[PDB]
């Protein structure tokens, strides 16, 4: 079955710019700005739309070695990005896939809000733990903060 988790966070960066950097240039930025969270991102197949497979490797000493993520949808208008964890890490005989949905909304102050949905699909019913969910949210925040800091510091980047 499916376990559904939703979380929200804010950014000081406008939605369009953040979407261009944090979502659309993730393969490039994550290992550059957050090397202690993501060691590399390899494009396995595809040119960046639905079905594109990427292999995300974690640094030495992390709980997991790598995950394979697949792009599900990319909406450039409404800054929505759906992707699934499809192999590696938590995926195996207890968890088939994690489907994720990220939407970035502009706020009046010039910042943005990110709305994050994570659906865990389980082999029958292997209870997804609060600690797996925390770890996921934390890694996303670490990633978001490293990118945010790079965009604050490099005003020419992603205009
Ligand atoms: C995984 N991201 C979409 C970041 C998600 C963080 S969050 O859960 O705080 O929204 C980026 C990503 C990068 C490369 C490939 C596929 C996805």
* CA 97 – CA 24 distance, rounded (Å): 22
Domain 1-159 has CATH 3.30.530.20: yes
- Among candidate residues 13, 43, 18, the one with its CA nearest the CA of residue 31: 43
Question: Is the Cβ–Cβ distance between 144 and 21 less than 8 Å?
Answer: no
Give residues with Cβ within 8 angstroms of 11, minimum separation 6.
18, 104, 111, 112, 113, 114, 144, 148
Starting at the earlier edge strand, list the strands of the sheet with 53-57: 2-11, 112-121, 97-106, 80-88, 66-75, 53-57, 40-45
By CB atoms closer than 10 A (0-12, 13-18, 19+), residue 38 is buried
Residues with CB under 6 A from ligand 1: 23, 26-27, 41, 54, 69, 81, 83, 102, 114, 116, 140, 143-144
What element of type H or E holds 28?
Answer: helix 26-33
* CA 50 – CA 56 distance, rounded (Å): 17
Instruction: State phi, psi for 15 to the nearest 5 degrees.
Output: -55, -45
- The structure was resolved to a resolution in Å of 2.1
The residue count for the chain = 159
- For the chain, what are the domain ranges? 1-159
Question: Is the Cβ–Cβ distance between 23 and 102 less than 8 Å?
Answer: yes
In ligand 1, the atom with minimum distance to the C-alpha of 9 is 9
- How many beta carbons lie within 10 A of that of residue 18, not counting itself? 24
Give residues with Cβ within 8 angstroms of 61, minimum separation 6.
none
| Cross-strand partners of 4 | 119
Compute CA 109 distance to the chain's CA centroid, rounded to the nearest angstrom: 24
- Among candidate residues 1, 25, 6, the one with its CA nearest the CA of residue 116: 6
Pairing of strands 2-11, 112-121: antiparallel
- How many beta carbons lie within 10 A of that of residue 62, not counting itself? 16
Which residues precede chain breaks (C–N over 2.5 Å) in the chain?
A: none
Instruction: State phi, psi for 59 to the nearest 5 degrees.
Output: -65, 165
């Amino acid at each position: 079955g499916v376990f559904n988790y939703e979380t929200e966070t804010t950014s000081v960066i406008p939605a369009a710019r953040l979407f261009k950097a944090f979502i659309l240039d993730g393969d490039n930025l994550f290992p550059k700005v957050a090397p202690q969270a993501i060691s590399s991102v390899e494009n396995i197949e595809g040119n960046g739309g639905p079905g594109t497979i990427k292999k995300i490797s974690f640094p030495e000493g992390f709980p997991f070695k790598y995950v394979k993520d697949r792009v599900d949808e990319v909406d450039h208008t409404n800054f929505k990005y759906n992707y699934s964890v499809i192999e590696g890490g938590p995926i195996g005989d207890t968890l088939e896939k994690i489907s994720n949905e990220i939407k970035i909304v502009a706020t009046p102050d010039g910042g943005s809000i990110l709305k994050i949905s994570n659906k865990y699909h389980t082999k029958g019913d292997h209870e997804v733990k609060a600690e797996q969910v925390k770890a996921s949210k934390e890694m996303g925040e670490t990633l978001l903060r490293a990118v945010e800091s790079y965009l604050l510091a490099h005003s020419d980047a992603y205009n």
